[PDB]
Design a binder for this molecule. Structure first.
Ligand SMILES: O[C@@H]1[C@H](O)[C@H](O)CO[C@H]1O
Ligand SMILES: [Ca+2]
Ligand SMILES: [Cl-]
Length: 287
């Protein structure tokens, strides 16, 4: 009897994606839907399998945080041709008019906020390293660009390594160990996301370099807690919970009478998190 909404994200070991799934699930059930929550583990084939499952089960809409900007177009198009609309969150696909919605953070704006804080904490000088996200995710390059466009105004600041750790805490730890051995004179690390920042601060701490300034991106409870404890200095909040709920609200409107948002692509504002507002943050929302 109940209509079904399928929710598909990357693995829940990154709290960002878990929070999206829980937010979407909550809104779906609040509006009378049953839910089917699946993970694709950043694997396009697994994402294909999961969308087939949504189709097979008769989902009325799919909420998707995708497995690659290019690779995901065909999957979303498969669902579409099966008569099932997709409402994308967090990550864009490199196509318009396929998804009904793409509701993402303003990544360039956000990244600039975090870089501005990084520069301030750095006193406009010194050697730093950058950890970059997954090449398949347009968010990785957009954030890097925003960071670069701030930091390139400060000639005394110098990047001594720029490496991908693929949005992975464990990869970030290992990369940081190697980077730190090559570059003992680093003053700071700026990271494209919070799981990489957690890996970095762990590696720094284990090397006895607690003085190094780390700035992340996402606003997770884990990084909040680090900020509160004097670890990481700042992050940038993406409204993950609200974004997932908005996607479901749009899906429900569409299911009900084919209301579509005026603009497919929608941006949500980011907010800088630091010691002054970390205590107002919980599960990707400020109060
Ligand atoms: O926006 C998300 C989050 O930053 C996550 O932590 C990594 O993937 C990005 O696309
Ligand atoms: Ca500039
Ligand atoms: Cl891709």
């Amino acid at each position: 009897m109940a209509d079904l909404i399928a929710i598909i994200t990357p693995a829940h070991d990154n709290p960002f994606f878990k929070a999206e799934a829980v937010g979407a699930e909550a809104k779906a059930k609040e509006l009378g839907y049953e839910t089917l929550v699946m993970t694709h583990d950043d694997d396009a084939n697994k994402q294909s399998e999961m969308i087939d499952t949504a189709i097979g089960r008769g989902a009325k809409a799919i909420i998707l945080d995708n497995a690659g900007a290019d690779a995901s177009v065909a999957a979303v198009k498969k669902a579409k041709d099966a008569g099932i609309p997709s409402f994308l969150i967090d990550r864009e696909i490199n196509a318009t008019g396929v998804a009904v919605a793409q509701i993402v953070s303003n990544n360039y704006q956000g990244a600039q906020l975090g870089a501005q804080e990084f520069v301030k904490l750095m006193g406009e000088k010194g050697n730093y390293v950058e950890l970059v996200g997954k090449e398949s995710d347009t968010n990785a390059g957009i954030r890097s660009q925003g960071y670069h466009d701030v930091i390139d105004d400060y000639p005394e600041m110098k990047s001594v390594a720029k490496q991908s750790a693929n949005w992975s805490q464990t990869e970030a730890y290992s990369k940081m160990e190697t980077i730190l051995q090559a570059n003992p004179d680093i003053k700071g690390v700026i990271s494209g996301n919070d799981t990489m920042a957690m890996g970095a601060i762990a590696a720094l701490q284990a090397a006895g370099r607690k003085d190094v300034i780390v700035v992340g991106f996402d606003g997770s409870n884990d990084v909040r807690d680090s900020i509160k404890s004097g670890g990481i200095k700042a992050t940038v909040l993406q409204p993950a919970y609200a974004q997932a709920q908005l996607a479901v609200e749009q899906a429900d409107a569409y299911i009900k009478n084919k209301t579509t948002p005026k603009e497919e692509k929608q941006l949500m504002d980011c907010v800088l998190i630091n010691a002054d507002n970390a205590g107002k943050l919980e599960t990707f929302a400020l109060t």
